[PDB]
């Protein structure tokens, strides 16, 4: 299961990192492994209300937990393949007094890096370029 | 029924860029054919509930994520025919000092395209351009 | 179903334009065909359960995708017959920067249009009317 | 079902408009007759699952939809009663530079009526008033 | 249960008002026996989802109408016994230009009334009091 | 009940308050037994949905009532234990113009108490210390 | 049980600190013990729907109460493996007003410790350095 999950990671492009995609690989099969043991004890007559309960308690926990680090990973899924934000193009984002300015250097699943005009690097947050007016000159 | 859910999303106007209506199809047929097939499977006895349980959280999960690019879609979908948004009149966005200046020059289901005085283009979401006044010269 | 459904909506008021009314009766039509065939097929026998759950995740995916587009609606269907939105009327929207100031000339159900001092034409969405100090001269 | 629907709504000085008395009557009758309706149809046999899933999400896209007219509503209902907002009352609300001054001349069920010094009417949200600091001279 | 639940709520502090006092037992000795009216009905072999459904989805709107009277009533109940909000005391509110200054006149369960030094009378949510820097001289 | 919940309640350290934890367990005893005696009445045959909605309705209310109060109490169990927050040490709370300063004199479960350079004493929320940056000289 | 937790959370690295490491694996032991329990209990014929019902509310309160805690330490987490935030590093956080500057001292699960040019230290939120703009030079 982990091979088969790995394989639709890749073919779909959601994760491009090995290591990211091996654990998400993992987990996937753990949560599917044990969904399938939960639907067969099930089956038999054993009583699977309180299991479903807590695992759905914890797992909603967690992904509200996670909710930002979901959210940067989907704005970065999104902004792929977007012709303003490449390599050495100059972008400004933000409007007013919240503004970034900078030139693009190196892309990631969680920031966006910019090399401003005195040297500094900066990190935006994927999900801040996502709702935000994109200058590009 | 990937067929049949691209005809649908042709007809409706939902979706009109043809790679992005296959995707869409054949994630609509996946998901109606794994209910079906959840559906038969507890029909004959073997228990739903976790398996039910588990899909029903990794989707809201997954739905949660993506929220941000469904508003936008939603938003480009609702725009769709308006006279001030074309292409060469003159808009601005936003009150105060968020405004944004330019000319329509391109529409996504993304982002709005101006063209500034100075020639910048800028990005502004379409879930901006909905909940914002819009000014139109 | 659907001319009941169109009359419903036509005597209600709450859909005013022909083509809107009649798309919305097909979706509601659609929507109560759908849970009577779900209600028929559950009475013989055959577990219901996955499809109840696939299409509450979708529609409530779709409601919240919709989320502007219903709450500007519902504020052009409350602000009709208010005396301070009449077509010439003077009217000025929001307090601080982020003021609008105009004419009312025209009235829609995802716009208010207002006419500047130099011509441009405003477009003050219906929910920022709402939640507003709308200030008429 | 409808005349005591009205009668406790007068009763209880909920809603003091006659014909939004008569509205809303009409609604929980109506309501009320449905939910009736649908437990004795499950009683004898006819499976209910689908049908109390699809009211129930549209009920809560509706509520959903009118936060904002409720909330309004549910402002003017706990105002009410309150020495500071009478007729002829010089009143003065928010803080800041988001602030609004002027003499209550009316009061109605979604908006609070100011006459500022040079004579604009101001319309103030139920809402607005309810979380706010209140300034009475 | 009325008597009962209005000595519960005098010996428990939540409501001091003897007419809000009485308005709360008569509703929770209402909701009370209509639950238990509800699960005999069940026993006995009627359908109940319907209606627990309807009655659920009536008091999520009503309790979601009512969030800020229910948050403000809470604030009222938590600030009881502070020796900062007193009679004669000059306090302060707010920080930056949001800022209420006054000294504490009288206490209610909706308001806390400040006399400026002009003599206006400041209306201050103790929703706010609950969340600000509160500054006392 | 009553005195297992007190004594785990000062074991864990979540309250430290005497009569605080004495309310706390006494409000956790009559949940737990309450809890049992729904469940014993459920095992007979009585049907317990009406009062499982009803009681899960009315602890959803409250809960989301008090969560200003539950927010501020956990935010005072996590500040426990930390360098920068001491008596007599000199804090400075926020940035820009909402900015807090002054010595920490006291501490509470609801309030972190500081003296100004005027002597105003200063009651900033321990939810607002947790989520800002503090400034300790 | 609580072994094999312990060294779950030291393997996968959620967790460092040997208390914390401890106490959550003393607090998931207890969870999988109660919900095993709780299954076992139904199994044999006892209504399990009141526990059930109870033990979410307890849980969803708990965590809605916790939720700036974990958000903190699931940014901690992220955080982990930054060449931006490492000790002697010169970092600034923040756009506009609200900036923050310093240099890297101390990192920890619940904020960041940056040293100012006067000398202050500085504690900057985890999940602020998240959501942030993270300049460094």
Same mark, same amino acid.
């Given at each position: 299961? @982990?091979?088969?999950?790995?394989?639709?990671?890749? +073919?779909?492009?959601?994760?491009?990192?090995?290591?990211?995609?091996?654990?998400?690989?993992?987990?996937?099969?753990?949560?599917?492994?044990?969904?399938?043991?939960?639907? =067969?004890?099930?089956?038999?007559?054993? +009583?699977?209300?309180? =299991?479903?309960?807590?695992?759905?308690?914890?797992?909603?926990?967690?992904?509200?937990?996670?909710?930002?680090?979901?959210?940067?990973?989907?704005?970065?899924?999104?902004?792929? &393949?977007?012709?303003?934000?490449?390599? &050495?193009?100059?972008?400004?984002?933000?409007?007013?007094?919240?503004?970034? @300015?900078?030139?693009?250097? +190196?892309?990631?699943?969680?920031?966006?890096?910019?090399?401003?005009?005195?040297?500094?690097?900066?990190?935006?947050?994927?999900?801040?370029? =996502?709702?935000?007016?994109?200058?590009?000159?």
């Amino acid at each position: 299961m @982990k091979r088969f999950f790995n394989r639709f990671y890749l +073919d779909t492009g959601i994760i491009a990192d090995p290591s990211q995609r091996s654990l998400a690989s993992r987990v996937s099969a753990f949560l599917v492994q044990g969904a399938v043991a939960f639907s =067969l004890l099930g089956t038999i007559g054993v +009583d699977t209300s309180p =299991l479903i309960a807590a695992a759905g308690v914890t797992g909603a926990t967690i992904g509200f937990a996670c909710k930002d680090f979901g959210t940067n990973f989907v704005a970065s899924i999104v902004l792929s &393949g977007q012709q303003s934000i490449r390599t &050495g193009n100059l972008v400004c984002i933000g409007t007013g007094l919240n503004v970034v @300015k900078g030139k693009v250097v +190196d892309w990631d699943t969680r920031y966006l890096y910019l090399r401003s005009s005195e040297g500094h690097l900066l990190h935006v947050p994927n999900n801040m370029v =996502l709702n935000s007016v994109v200058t590009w000159e």
